[PDB]
């Protein structure tokens, strides 16, 4: 009946707090931006709990960072990208991922300006 604690004017859904920034900046900058407001970039951990993410259009930086040695990815908070959550689209050389509609993540150059999503739960 009440959506979990969130800042002012932040999208709240199932007690998660999202915020889409129209401003176009690079991953590094996007990271800091969220950082600078007690929040992370965007971490996908549940298709169910994070259902609304399939209605979003365009591409947005997520809090994904990979280790190009295990071809694996992990989030800012140190946790690994659990399988069966995101369909990572692989043209590379890039080392960052952009969240795209219907649980997809396009790998791109981390220095390419782009809109981003900040998340904060609880």
């Amino acid at each position: 009946s009440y959506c979990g604690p969130c800042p002012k004017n932040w999208i709240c859904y199932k007690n998660n707090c999202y915020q889409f920034f129209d401003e176009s900046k690079n991953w590094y900058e996007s990271q800091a931006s969220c950082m600078s407001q007690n929040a992370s970039l965007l971490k996908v951990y549940s298709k169910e709990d994070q259902d609304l993410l399939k209605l979003v259009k365009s591409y947005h930086w997520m809090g994904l960072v990979h280790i190009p040695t295990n071809g694996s990815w992990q989030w800012e908070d140190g946790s690994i990208l659990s399988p069966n959550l995101l369909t990572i689209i692989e043209m590379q050389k890039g080392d960052c991922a952009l969240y795209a509609s219907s649980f997809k993540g396009y790998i791109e150059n981390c220095s390419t300006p782009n809109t981003y999503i900040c998340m904060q739960r609880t």
């Binding site: 365009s58 689209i89 692989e90 043209m91």
Partner: protein, 170 residues
């Protein structure tokens, strides 16, 4: 060697009879494998069932995007400058990976616009297409949608169909 993937959309604004507003024919390495009603989510005749392209993760993703591309073009077709928009989206992998992603737009059988995803250049083919170019060139979202889907999504399904086309054989 090189491989390609061709998607030929037929989008109609204000369908007249029993015409479906969305239709798409596809070809893997120049030849057919799927006819799909992108408006009602319906495979109409996916000839070439000896490679089970369906039964690949790419298959559904592919249909997903075919529907999204069809819906985007529909809205765009609704505010142009019954109208039949024929579009061909293509991607081709060479021996290195050099993927060429491009789009071709027609409106009644006469080519109108060409989009070079790679160089990201909109080039006019018809005098009367100068305005749509402007609009779409300035619609950064649309144009980026055209680059992302043909340069990556399409190369992705190509890669998976191929990687699958072999494991069977060898």
């Amino acid at each position: 060697d090189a491989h390609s993937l061709w998607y030929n959309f037929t989008i109609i604004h204000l369908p007249r009879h029993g015409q479906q507003w969305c239709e798409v024919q596809s070809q893997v390495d120049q030849k057919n494998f799927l006819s799909y009603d992108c408006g009602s989510d319906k495979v109409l005749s996916m000839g070439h069932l000896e490679e089970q392209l369906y039964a690949t993760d790419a298959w559904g993703k592919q249909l997903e995007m075919l529907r999204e591309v069809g819906q985007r073009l529909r809205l765009e077709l609704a505010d142009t400058e019954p109208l039949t928009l024929q579009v061909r989206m293509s991607c081709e992998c060479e021996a290195d990976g050099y993927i060429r992603g491009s789009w071709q737009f027609s409106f009644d059988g006469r080519k109108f616009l060409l989009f070079d995803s790679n160089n990201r250049k909109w080039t006019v083919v018809h005098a009367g297409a100068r305005r749509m170019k402007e609009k779409w060139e300035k619609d950064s979202g649309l144009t980026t949608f055209f680059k992302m889907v043909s340069m990556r999504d399409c190369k992705s399904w190509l890669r998976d169909f191929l990687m699958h086309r072999k494991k069977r054989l060898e």
